[PDB]
Each structure stands twice: as C-alpha cells, then as structure tokens.
Amino acid sequence: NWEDYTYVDPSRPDGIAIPSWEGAEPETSDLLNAVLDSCLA
Amino acid sequence: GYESTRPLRYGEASLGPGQPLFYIDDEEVDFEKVINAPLPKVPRDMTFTAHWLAVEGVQPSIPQNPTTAEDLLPKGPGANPALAALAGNDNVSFRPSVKHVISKELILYFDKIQAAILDDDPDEEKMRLRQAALESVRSDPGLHQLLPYFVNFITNQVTHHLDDLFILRQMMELAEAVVQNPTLFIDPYASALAAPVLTCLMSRKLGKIDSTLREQYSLRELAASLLSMIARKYGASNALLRPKLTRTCLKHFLDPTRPPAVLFGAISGVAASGGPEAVRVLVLPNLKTFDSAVLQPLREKAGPVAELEYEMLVGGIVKAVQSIVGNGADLTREGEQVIEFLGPIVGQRIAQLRNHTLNRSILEVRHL
Amino acid sequence: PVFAPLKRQYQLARLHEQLQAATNGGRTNIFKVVGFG
Amino acid sequence: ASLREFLNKMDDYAPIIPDAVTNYYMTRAGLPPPPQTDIRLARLLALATQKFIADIAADAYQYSRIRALGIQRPGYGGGGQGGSQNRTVLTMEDLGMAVSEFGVNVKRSEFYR
Amino acid sequence: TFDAPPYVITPEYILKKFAGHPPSLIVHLYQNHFRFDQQEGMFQYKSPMRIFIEHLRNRTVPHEIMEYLIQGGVPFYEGCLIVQVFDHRT
Amino acid sequence: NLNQIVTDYLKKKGFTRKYLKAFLLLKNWIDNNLDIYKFELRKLLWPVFVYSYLELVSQGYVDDAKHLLETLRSHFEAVHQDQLALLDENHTTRLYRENKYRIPLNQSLSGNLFHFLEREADNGGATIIYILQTHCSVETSARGPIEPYSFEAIYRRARNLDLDEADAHGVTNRDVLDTSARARDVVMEMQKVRENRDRFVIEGRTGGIGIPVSACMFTFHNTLGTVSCMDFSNDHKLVAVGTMDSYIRVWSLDGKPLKSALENEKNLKVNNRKLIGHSGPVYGVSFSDSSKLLLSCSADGQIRLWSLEIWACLCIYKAHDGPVFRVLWGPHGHYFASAGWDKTVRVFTQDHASAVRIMVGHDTSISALAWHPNGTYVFSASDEMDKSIRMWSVITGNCVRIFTGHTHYITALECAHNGKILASADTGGNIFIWDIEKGTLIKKCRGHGKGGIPSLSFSAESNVLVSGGLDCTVRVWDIELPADPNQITPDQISAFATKKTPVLKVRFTRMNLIVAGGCYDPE
Amino acid sequence: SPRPRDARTLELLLTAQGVTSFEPRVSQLLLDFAYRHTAAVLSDALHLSSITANAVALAISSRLGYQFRGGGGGYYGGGGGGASKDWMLELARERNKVALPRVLPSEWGVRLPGERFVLSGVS
Amino acid sequence: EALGLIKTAYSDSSVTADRAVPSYYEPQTIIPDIDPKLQWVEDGEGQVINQFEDMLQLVPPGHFTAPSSRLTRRIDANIRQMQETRKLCSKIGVIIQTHPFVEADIEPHYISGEGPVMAGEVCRSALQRSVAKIFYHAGFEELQPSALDCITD
Amino acid sequence: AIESFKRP
C-alpha cells in the first residue's frame, strides 16, 4: 500500500480523516538488457 | 541506590602507619523515625516573565538586569573607539560626531531625499521625483541608523515653518511614510511623532481666498488620520499615550474662545484618539450646552467664510457622532427625543439620517 | 569488534578464491586489452 | 474471576501508595494522569507495584531468618555498630540475596583505601 | 585544473567525448559461461563472478574487484568504464 | 602534500585538463491605508473582480470562474445581489466589454497606487496593472480625497456646485455630490515609476559603525534544572520546552488562553498545556511552518508528531537504533530531518512511516543539524575523532561538501537567508564563517567564553549575526566591516550580559529586534 | 572530611574535561562500577583455567560480544552499535534508489500516512 | 507610578542634567512598557509572584497520603497489633515504648492549569515511606539507609 | 466603568 494516505482534520474524533564504436549503448540498450537477462536467467 | 538525598559521609580506618582505609558511614535506625518524619517542601510551579535586556544597543539600569559592579568591549589595536560610545557607558570620554557613526553613502542618501521632497516647483518630473523619494523612504530595508534623524528633522521643520502649508503637508506625508516601513522598530519614538502632528491639527494659525481654506482643512483632516493611525499602532507600549491625547483634545474642545477651525481640529482629534466610547461618554452629554453658547452666534453670522466655518464644524461634529456605530412613524418618535438631548442644530441632522441603532446608542446615555 | 552479515563474508571469500585461481596469484593480467576495440 | 468485576471492586482494593506518586511516575513513563485516565486503571497499577514489593520483602525476610565459618559474603558492604537488642535488621546482604532471584545485582566494595 | 563531469552523465556524452580511445574492457558471452579478451579460462554464470555481470546490467562500476582493476592498469574515463560485449549466444 | 595526492587521483581516474491572489493583495493593501483614502480606493474593488470573472469564462476555466465567484460573493452579498445573480452572451456583458470602466482618483493616490503595484509586480501587481490598462480608465484629478463629510463634499454641497464630467461615472461620488444627498498613460507611468525609483539606491558602505539592536528576554523560574530544550514558533506567539521528565510544556507568550477544537473544551481558560507520551528525556522540539504541528524526539529513540489544535499525538516514527538527539522541520514544512547516536542522518516526509533518505559517512555521533533555504540540501556535524561538517544533497543522498577546522565540540549550525554563507559554533568560544561554493573558511569570531554556544541567528539581509551563549551573554556580530575611509575580535558590535541566566534560544524578528529565552538559576 | 583516593582523582579528571559541577554521588558510582567489572571479568577468567594473561584476554574478548559496543571510536572504530560501514553503505544504496514522493500543492503540509500507521481509535 | 497612573517593576524591592521638560522632548530616553501580568516581581521571601490568579487551582488535601479502603485499613491494624504484642513481650521479659505511625501532609499548594505536580523529591520521599511501611509489615524492626535507598530505586 | 456609566 504505497499510496495509502490519511489527512489532518481537527473536526474528527482523533483529528484524522480516513478517506473511504559499434552498437552504441543508447540505440541497443534494450537488446543488450534482454541478452543479459537471459544470461542471468 | 545512588539517587539518595542523604549526605555522603566517609569514615577512616588504619591498616598501620600510612595505610588508611575508607568506608561508607551508615547506622541502623528505627522504622518509627523514618515513617513519622515530615516531608520536604514543595517548590512553586513553573512560570515565566519578561523584561528589556537592551534598547537600541544600551542596557537599562533596571532591577532585572545585572549591576555594573558585577571584559565585554574589544580593546585591540583595530577596535573602534566610538564603539564604547554605542554601549552608553558613563565613564566614556570620547564624544563621536555624525561622521564617526554614519557612513558617507547614508549621508548622501539623506541629503538627496531631503532635497527631493522639499521642492516646490510645479513641474511634473519634480512631482514624480517627490513620489519616488517617498516610496524609497517607505520601502528601503537599510535605514535603521537614520530613524532618530528623521524624527528630529520632522520636528525641526514643523517647528520653524508654521507659515507654509506646502512644507507642513510634506512633513505629514514623510511622517506617514516613516511609520509604514515594516523593518523599523518605532515604539520608543511614538510620542515624539505625536507632537508635530498635534501641532498641525489644533494650531491657531496655519499658513499666511477659498484655496487657503481648502488647504488648511485638508491638512487638518490628514493630521487627524495620521493621529488615529499612531494611536492605534503604538498605544500598548506607551501606556499613557491615549488618555493624554484624548485629554488634550477634550481640553481644547470645551473652550468657547477658540476659533472654529481649532474646534474642528479638536473634535476630530477626540474622535481619532479616544474612540467610540470616548465620544459617547465625554462629548454627547456636553453637546446640549455647546450648541447654545457656541454654535448659535456663529450661525448668526452672514459672511461666506462664516458659512463655510459653520458647515465644516457641524459636519465634523456629525461625523464624530456617527462614528459610534459606523419601524414606521413610531421610529420618528425616538428621533424627536434626540432633538431634545443633542439640541436642535445637531439633533435635527442626526434624526434626518433615519437610523435606529445610532438613535438607541445616543439615547442610552441620557441620564449622564 | 565490527559486525556484518555472514552472507557477504562467505561471498567475498569465494570471489577472492576464484580470482586468485584465475590470475595465478597475480602473475597473469586477464584484463589486458590489445588493440583499439 | 472477571476483569470487569475486579475493576468494579476497586473501591476496596486501593493500595497504600498516594495518588501524587502514581501521577508523577505515570507521567514520567508517558501516561496522562487520572483526570484523563481512569482512576481505576491507576489504582490497579499501584496495586501491582505494592504486590511486587511485598514479594521482595517476604523474601529477604526468609533469608534473614535462615541465617540465624560464619563470615559475611564479600560484596555487600554496609552497616555500623550493627543495631541493638535481638531485633531483625534489614541489611544489604539479605536484600541482595533476595533480589538476585529477580535479576538484580547490588554488589559494592566494602572499603576504598 | 580539471574539467568536472555534468550533473547527469549519459552514455552519449562519454562515448562522443572519448572517441578514438581503446575500450576499458572487452567481454565475450557464451551459452553457459563468459570470459575476457585475453583470458585463458572461463567464468560460469553461476559462479561468484556472476556479480560482475550484474554490474553490467546496472551500468555501475564493480568496486568489489577494484584492486584487481588497479593492478592490471585498466583505464578510466572521468571515473567511468567503457565495456565492449561480444555475443556468441545467438 | 595533499595537493599531489589529489592531483594523482584525478589523473588516474581519467579526468582531462491567479486573479484571486491579486484581488486579495489589493484588498489587504487597501485595508492597510489611512482612513481618509479608503473611500476612493474601494472603487477599484468591483471592476477588478467582474472583468476577471468574465476573463475566466472567456478562457474556458468554468470551474475556476465558479470558485472565484463563490469565494468573493460574501463581500458583495449586501449590494450586488442582482449583478451576482445575473453573472451566475447577455447585453450587459457586451456593454461592459465595449464601454471601459471609469475610475476617478486623486493624483497623489494614483502615484502611491502605481508605486505599490510596481513594488509588488511579480506577486500579483502585473495582473491588476494589465486589467486596469485593458478595461479601465483612471481619470486622475488634482482634487483632495472625497468623503461624505470631507471638505470637498461639504464645500460643493454648501456652494451648490455642479458635477464634474470626469467624476460623473455601483456607488459613485455623484450620489455624494448630487442634490439628492486627463486620460491616462499607463505603461508609460510604470516606466517613469521605475526610472525615478532607480535614483535612490544605496551602493556601498564606507566609514561608520555597526547597527543598533534591541533585545527582549524571557526568563523561566522554578525549573530546577529539568529543562532540556526550548523553541519559539514562527510568529513569536508560542514557546515550547522539553524537560528531563519526558513531557513537553507549551505557553502562549502574551498570557492569553489557549484554544482547543474539542467540543468539551469549548471556551476553556488556560494559557499553558502539557504534551505527555514520551518515555525518556526530550532533546528536541520543532514548530512547523499560526503553527499547527509540533515534532519531538526523545532518548527512547522515537519521533512524535503532535497536533496543536487538539493537543494530541498523531504519528510515531521508529527508524532509529538508540537515542535521537536532533529533529528539524524543513524551510517550508513538509520534509524533516533527524539525527542522533547511530551516526546516520535520516530524512522523512510526514506522508510516509519509513524514512525516504538515509545519509551515511559520519564516523561518530551527530551533534548539530541545519537546512538550506531552498529545501534541497542538509548540513550535519559530528564530534570526537571526526569533528567535520558535511553537506548532503536530498535528490541523490550523497555528500557534496566537507568543512574541516573545528577542534572542539560543535553546538550550533546556521545558514544565511541568501543561501551563500554558513556559520558554526563550538565549546571553545569560536564562531566559524564559511563560504559554501568554495568550501573555504571566510573568518573566525572570538569573544564568547567556554561551555557552548547553543543558538545563532541571521538578520533579514544576512548582514548581521546574533549568538547566545552559556556564559550568560548575547553578542552581535558584523558580517562585513566597512571600508577604510583613509580576546575579542573587532567585528563584534554589542554584548549584553544576563542576570544568572544561560541563553538557550535567540531569534531575529523582521526588525532590528531580537527575542531570547532562558532559565534563571538563583544559585 | 575524609575522602578516598581515586575519588579526588576522578573528580579532578572530570574537572579537567570541562565539567563545571557534578553531584557528589558520581565518584562512588564509578568506583562500584569498576569493582563489578573487575569481579565479573576475573570470575570468567577463573573457569577458563594459576591464571595467565591469555585467559584474561579471552574472557575480555568473550564479554565484548554482547556489551560495550560504544565509545568514541572513529575510522573503523566499533562505536554507535558496531555496524560495519560497507553494510550501511549498501543499505543506503538500496534505500536512496527510489524516486521522491509526488506531492501536490494542495496536500503539502496536510497529508498523513495510511490508516494502518496512525493513532486512531486509541482512547 | 506614585500617583497610581501605571504599574512598573522598576523599584529596588521588585528583585531581591535633570531637565524640566516632558519626556516626548527626549525620544532617546524612553523604554517601552511590559504587560503588568508578565513583570518580574518578587515577594518578601524572594519568590516570584504569579500574576494569573484566576487560573490557579488548589491541590486537594490528602493527595500526599494513603487512600482509604478496606485494604489500606487492616494493614494499619496489623501493625498496631504487632506493636502492642511487642510491648507485652517487653513486659514479660522484664519479669520498650513505641509511638503510633502517622503520615504528614504537605503545605497548601497551587498549580497553574490542569496537570500533575512534578516534584521529584517529595514523590520519592512518599514512595520511600510506603516501602518502609511494607517492610515493617514483613517483620523487620531496624534498617540500613543504603538498603532502603536501593529498594526505593 | 462603561457599565457603571450606563447605569441610570
């Protein structure tokens, strides 16, 4: 729950409201990443 | 066991020549002694106070500060001597001059401002320069060392130029601009500013045909507004400022010998300094007589100047009365009572407004 | 003493063993590059 | 034996600890005093403390009594002339012997030189 | 005096600034193992040197073997390493 | 030779050789004026609103237009009900667009208004300037201010004069002057305003001495040495002290009752309150950017957030191993930082339970913290074998600057309001002034005794420094001495001694006035 | 009044370090702490055994496994808990890799953590 | 102030040329005013006076002594019985005089606002008295001060 | 004082 939030509300019981070069890197990085992921398995 | 409040004592034993041993001093006691003993004394609860440690760089000799009897000032080769004068010490023998305390840029700035503001030429560029100088005084964040000089300059100019409406108007505008700067601590000088303003409000003679009266009455109105601002802003740190101003204005008002302009200025000042309750409690009860021994002879005059003076004075009194707060034919009945209380001249004007809250407020102090 | 997890210690020991075996105790440069790539 | 009945009978089970001490130590620990906290909960806490102290007293009295060759145990320096009459004296030795069972060490030096 | 690196360092800036220089490292990848250009043996992907491969995935400098890089005189370019990868898997 | 080492390392590493804001601003400015003018300036309120609303309707921002109309309807509910209802294309709107509003004003009043608008051009002045230039015509006249009982109205009514054409044209002076009782050069005016304002600038400092300063002292009685930390709120309305007894105590600084939002606590009469809930001594308290929130840290290793509207704890943060020594809100009050015994500096937001940034690299415990006025950098100092100051970036979490030179325990850190200068103090009595961009020491200030300088503060323009010491003194320091006209260092301006009261907190106001706090020890 | 030695010595040492005042019962606290530490260490060393210096060193090393992880140690000195610096560096690397949270101007200063982590319904 | 116009703390007892013109002619001699309720004034004993009297509350009596209950009673009865039987033993042995246990209270105290009384010394002393009573109930008759301090801690 | 003044 990375985006779970409450709010400050002084009118609530607790004060809280709960919402309800060859092959240069830039042009081949994805292919190299695929190969490296295959190698790492 | 080391939080005990008992004193720590040591006893000494001997193992021989030059071989001492130390032990803790204890002793068996009864339970009756411990249980029946009284409790220590309760200290008072936490609190705090306030006082002035320094004022403009000088420590006052008040009970809350340390005594001079009982290493704070530099005494090296490069330390300035004038620094010892800034601490306000008594033994100082050096008396600095203006050049020793104020930098050359600030002196040039002061001279430029005073040259610009006091120019009477009607050229448009001169008016723009005057407005720019006033804005500079009103906004500059580095004028902490020129405040006493501004106050002294305003006082001097008002004192020595009471026969010049232009200069007095400029002085009032400069005083207004000085107290609107948010970087300045103005409290201690408040009364020093209230003396020139007052002189511009109730002075018997101002300047030396209609245009002159326009200028005089405009100046008096501006002075009253500035006095209201000063009293509102600095009335708490100067405890006796408001009663003093109100008493001065009231003393000037209840005087049939004064000319109508001074009476207009006095009533404006009473309203500005006292407030609604001051008018209700001090002015209204005395109005019945005032309109008979003062206003009637002035009304009987026929000159245009007399007409203008009468109208201005009546308008000022009516405005002061209205300042307190801001049913069919039955309502008119209430209005009639006012003509009996405030008199004809002012009662009629107040009743013509057809207001009920004002009528009730005015009638509430009939017994006085 | 200075404290750390056991896993890192074991992993680093193993890596040092492998690299010492590969480099022959420092007598061989395996990272050398001949040419310009 | 319910908690509700016990808390309702708290009138008859108040300990000998004054309320001021209870409030002071509750505040030190982090609990607002009985004006905002229930008075019965504070009374229960004080009663638990009294029970613990009475346990530690009953032991160390047992230790003093079984003690009545023959030298003191090192590490419990205290006392003076040793009291008077055949009276039972609360000494550092007995208190240390008793509280060692609760996990507390109270050992000192007898002399300092 | 020396030139400082930019706020965000990118492969384009380094590869354009340092053209004409030899690469820092060369690595050959095979079906089940990899090696370096001048190495005689081999490293298995399941071995400890697997760590190096992870760095190659994250574009990070492998500090855990830094000593071995200093011994061999591996060149640095503004603190970065240029690595060429030969792929025989396919 | 460290230079040779650094050069070798660098060589080997490959280094080569909207409208509502403007309306509110105008309303406040009008509220702050003299009474004699308030009648005239108010005439500007009705147009600036109406046209503005229409503008949004023209730009498709229907929701913004509705919000603006609803927010400002209260100010005009007693007069403009019909117009408000009509606005909530008609022929009236076409007439408004075709016919530009006329706004008579006095000459001096117009000059003041123009200078004020220029002075605040980027905070909302540009909007009003543009609106006036486009849909208004300010017919200036050399008369005096007009009021129902001023000289102008009285004279005109008495002499039975006519109505001026400029002032002829929903309240107008006509209803005040009627028997029933020029043009403009905007843009050019702004150019003249700027040109004239440029002529009154101060551009140096040769000769003279420092600046006078006033001080107000708050003293606490019957504390018995239980007070550990003290803090003032941003507006000098509240004071908070943390003690060795685990509780916090807050007071209003003028003695008035403190207010609670709880229904049971309606109209309660107390001017001080207690925050309870820590289990060990409290070592830090920090007011948030009136202050609504408080942060505290204790020896129990926890950080607590309190609401000052209901006076209760909202959240506990538990990211530390061992005691926490210092905690600090950010310059604008959503991020905060903490540091203590375990040598790590942590940065949190109030949104998340876990710290978002961790800063590692100090070799000893942390003893001081400080923020940068832009909110993206932090400062930390360590003690003992590592007496250094480190500067940390919040985006990456890395260290960017190290300052070295202290040989005593460091008690305080402070960054100037201009973001370019740093100050530190230790238990030897020295104050170090550092340049941040160069990483060099600018100078040292001496004169305090030994024991610790717990608090420092800069002035609004960062040209003066105020320090408070445990030797019972408050001292003022010149950051740059004036040019030569042709135990204690010569850059001290003033020293004020206290009456047996060590100083814990000092702070500058907007003026040349400071407030200090301390505890009185009669023995 | 009588006072043991090493007490005057501890108090003079404290004064030499910048302490301007101390309570009377600090010296005896320190003396009793020293007594306890010595007794525990040599009681440990007795069981590992005449006692040699190696037994004392081993007893000290064993005791150092669960206490005294403090002091003012600097570069690679076991203070502040005794954690290795490389471990802390890699923990920081794991943490600081995430993007900073996105906050709108309308929730700056008012948004709180999730309901699981706040003190609601505690009275 | 001698005329009853103002309240000031400038007198000596609070803490234990001559130009003939009004003060507004000399701006650089004036000191601003402090609220009378925040002024530092001390009484004869040397204690600061708290000016906010409307917010002071009196601590109730009996707050520093044991409460009354079935349990708090009968412990006093047990101790009284012990003392009486010990007197009888003394007489029997002859063929010596003890005083009853009484707990003292504090002098009247005032607190500003609602909160507990944070006085460590008095609270520790009352706790020590309670511990001593329990230990006398256990069976002891004499004590060593250091042991009592240790158990109180 | 104001209340006293208002008192008939």
Short mmCIF file of N, CA and C in Angstrom, two decimals, chain F residues 21-73:
data_model
loop_
_atom_site.label_atom_id
_atom_site.label_comp_id
_atom_site.label_asym_id
_atom_site.label_seq_id
_atom_site.Cartn_x
_atom_site.Cartn_y
_atom_site.Cartn_z
N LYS F 21 -5.39 35.82 -6.12
CA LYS F 21 -4.22 36.30 -5.41
C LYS F 21 -4.08 37.81 -5.54
N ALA F 22 -4.25 38.33 -6.76
CA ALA F 22 -4.17 39.77 -6.97
C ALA F 22 -5.28 40.50 -6.22
N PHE F 23 -6.49 39.95 -6.25
CA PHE F 23 -7.60 40.59 -5.55
C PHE F 23 -7.33 40.66 -4.05
N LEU F 24 -6.82 39.58 -3.47
CA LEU F 24 -6.52 39.58 -2.04
C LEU F 24 -5.39 40.55 -1.72
N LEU F 25 -4.37 40.61 -2.57
CA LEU F 25 -3.28 41.56 -2.35
C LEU F 25 -3.82 42.99 -2.33
N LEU F 26 -4.66 43.32 -3.31
CA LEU F 26 -5.23 44.67 -3.36
C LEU F 26 -6.10 44.94 -2.14
N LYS F 27 -6.89 43.95 -1.71
CA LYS F 27 -7.76 44.14 -0.56
C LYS F 27 -6.95 44.43 0.70
N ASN F 28 -5.88 43.65 0.92
CA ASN F 28 -5.04 43.90 2.09
C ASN F 28 -4.39 45.28 2.01
N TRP F 29 -3.86 45.65 0.84
CA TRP F 29 -3.24 46.96 0.72
C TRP F 29 -4.23 48.07 1.04
N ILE F 30 -5.46 47.96 0.54
CA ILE F 30 -6.48 48.96 0.84
C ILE F 30 -6.78 48.97 2.33
N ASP F 31 -6.80 47.79 2.96
CA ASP F 31 -7.08 47.71 4.39
C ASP F 31 -6.00 48.39 5.21
N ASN F 32 -4.76 48.42 4.72
CA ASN F 32 -3.64 48.96 5.48
C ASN F 32 -3.41 50.45 5.27
N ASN F 33 -4.30 51.14 4.56
CA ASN F 33 -4.11 52.55 4.24
C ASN F 33 -4.73 53.45 5.31
N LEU F 34 -4.46 54.75 5.19
CA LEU F 34 -5.11 55.73 6.04
C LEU F 34 -6.60 55.79 5.72
N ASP F 35 -7.40 56.16 6.73
CA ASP F 35 -8.85 56.16 6.56
C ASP F 35 -9.28 57.15 5.49
N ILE F 36 -8.65 58.32 5.44
CA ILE F 36 -9.10 59.40 4.56
C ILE F 36 -9.09 58.99 3.10
N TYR F 37 -8.34 57.94 2.74
CA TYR F 37 -8.29 57.46 1.36
C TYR F 37 -9.20 56.27 1.10
N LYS F 38 -9.64 55.56 2.14
CA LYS F 38 -10.31 54.28 1.94
C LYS F 38 -11.56 54.42 1.08
N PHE F 39 -12.20 55.60 1.08
CA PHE F 39 -13.40 55.77 0.27
C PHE F 39 -13.08 55.65 -1.21
N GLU F 40 -11.96 56.22 -1.66
CA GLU F 40 -11.65 56.23 -3.08
C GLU F 40 -11.17 54.87 -3.56
N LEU F 41 -10.17 54.30 -2.89
CA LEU F 41 -9.56 53.06 -3.36
C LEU F 41 -10.59 51.95 -3.52
N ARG F 42 -11.62 51.92 -2.67
CA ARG F 42 -12.60 50.85 -2.74
C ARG F 42 -13.31 50.81 -4.09
N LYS F 43 -13.36 51.93 -4.81
CA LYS F 43 -13.98 51.93 -6.13
C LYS F 43 -13.29 50.96 -7.08
N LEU F 44 -12.04 50.60 -6.81
CA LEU F 44 -11.32 49.66 -7.65
C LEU F 44 -11.73 48.21 -7.41
N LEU F 45 -12.43 47.93 -6.31
CA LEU F 45 -12.71 46.54 -5.96
C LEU F 45 -13.71 45.90 -6.92
N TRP F 46 -14.81 46.59 -7.20
CA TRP F 46 -15.87 45.99 -8.02
C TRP F 46 -15.41 45.69 -9.44
N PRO F 47 -14.77 46.61 -10.17
CA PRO F 47 -14.36 46.26 -11.54
C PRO F 47 -13.37 45.11 -11.60
N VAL F 48 -12.26 45.21 -10.85
CA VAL F 48 -11.20 44.21 -10.92
C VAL F 48 -11.78 42.81 -10.80
N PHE F 49 -12.81 42.64 -9.97
CA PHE F 49 -13.46 41.34 -9.84
C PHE F 49 -14.23 40.99 -11.10
N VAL F 50 -15.21 41.82 -11.46
CA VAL F 50 -16.16 41.45 -12.52
C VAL F 50 -15.41 41.02 -13.77
N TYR F 51 -14.62 41.94 -14.34
CA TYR F 51 -13.88 41.62 -15.56
C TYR F 51 -13.10 40.32 -15.38
N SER F 52 -12.39 40.19 -14.26
CA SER F 52 -11.61 38.98 -14.03
C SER F 52 -12.47 37.74 -14.21
N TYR F 53 -13.63 37.72 -13.56
CA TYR F 53 -14.53 36.58 -13.71
C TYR F 53 -14.83 36.33 -15.18
N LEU F 54 -15.27 37.37 -15.90
CA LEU F 54 -15.57 37.21 -17.31
C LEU F 54 -14.39 36.61 -18.05
N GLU F 55 -13.17 37.05 -17.71
CA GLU F 55 -12.00 36.54 -18.40
C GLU F 55 -11.94 35.02 -18.32
N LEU F 56 -12.17 34.47 -17.13
CA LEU F 56 -12.15 33.02 -16.99
C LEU F 56 -13.22 32.39 -17.87
N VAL F 57 -14.42 32.97 -17.90
CA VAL F 57 -15.48 32.44 -18.75
C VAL F 57 -15.05 32.48 -20.21
N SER F 58 -14.21 33.44 -20.58
CA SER F 58 -13.73 33.52 -21.95
C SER F 58 -12.66 32.47 -22.23
N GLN F 59 -11.92 32.04 -21.21
CA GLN F 59 -10.81 31.11 -21.39
C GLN F 59 -11.21 29.66 -21.13
N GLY F 60 -12.48 29.39 -20.84
CA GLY F 60 -12.94 28.03 -20.63
C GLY F 60 -12.72 27.48 -19.24
N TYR F 61 -12.13 28.25 -18.33
CA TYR F 61 -11.90 27.80 -16.96
C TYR F 61 -13.18 28.01 -16.15
N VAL F 62 -14.19 27.22 -16.48
CA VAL F 62 -15.51 27.38 -15.86
C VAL F 62 -15.44 27.11 -14.36
N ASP F 63 -14.73 26.05 -13.96
CA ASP F 63 -14.64 25.73 -12.54
C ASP F 63 -13.94 26.83 -11.76
N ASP F 64 -12.85 27.36 -12.31
CA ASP F 64 -12.15 28.46 -11.64
C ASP F 64 -13.04 29.69 -11.53
N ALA F 65 -13.78 30.00 -12.59
CA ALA F 65 -14.69 31.14 -12.55
C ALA F 65 -15.75 30.95 -11.47
N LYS F 66 -16.32 29.75 -11.38
CA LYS F 66 -17.33 29.48 -10.36
C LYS F 66 -16.74 29.62 -8.96
N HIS F 67 -15.54 29.07 -8.75
CA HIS F 67 -14.91 29.17 -7.44
C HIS F 67 -14.63 30.62 -7.07
N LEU F 68 -14.13 31.41 -8.02
CA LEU F 68 -13.87 32.82 -7.76
C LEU F 68 -15.16 33.56 -7.44
N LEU F 69 -16.22 33.31 -8.20
CA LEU F 69 -17.49 33.99 -7.96
C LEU F 69 -18.04 33.64 -6.58
N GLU F 70 -17.96 32.36 -6.20
CA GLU F 70 -18.49 31.95 -4.90
C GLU F 70 -17.67 32.52 -3.75
N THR F 71 -16.34 32.51 -3.88
CA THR F 71 -15.49 32.94 -2.78
C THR F 71 -15.72 34.41 -2.43
N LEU F 72 -15.83 35.27 -3.44
CA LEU F 72 -15.95 36.70 -3.24
C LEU F 72 -17.40 37.19 -3.21
N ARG F 73 -18.37 36.28 -3.27
CA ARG F 73 -19.77 36.71 -3.24
C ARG F 73 -20.13 37.32 -1.89
#
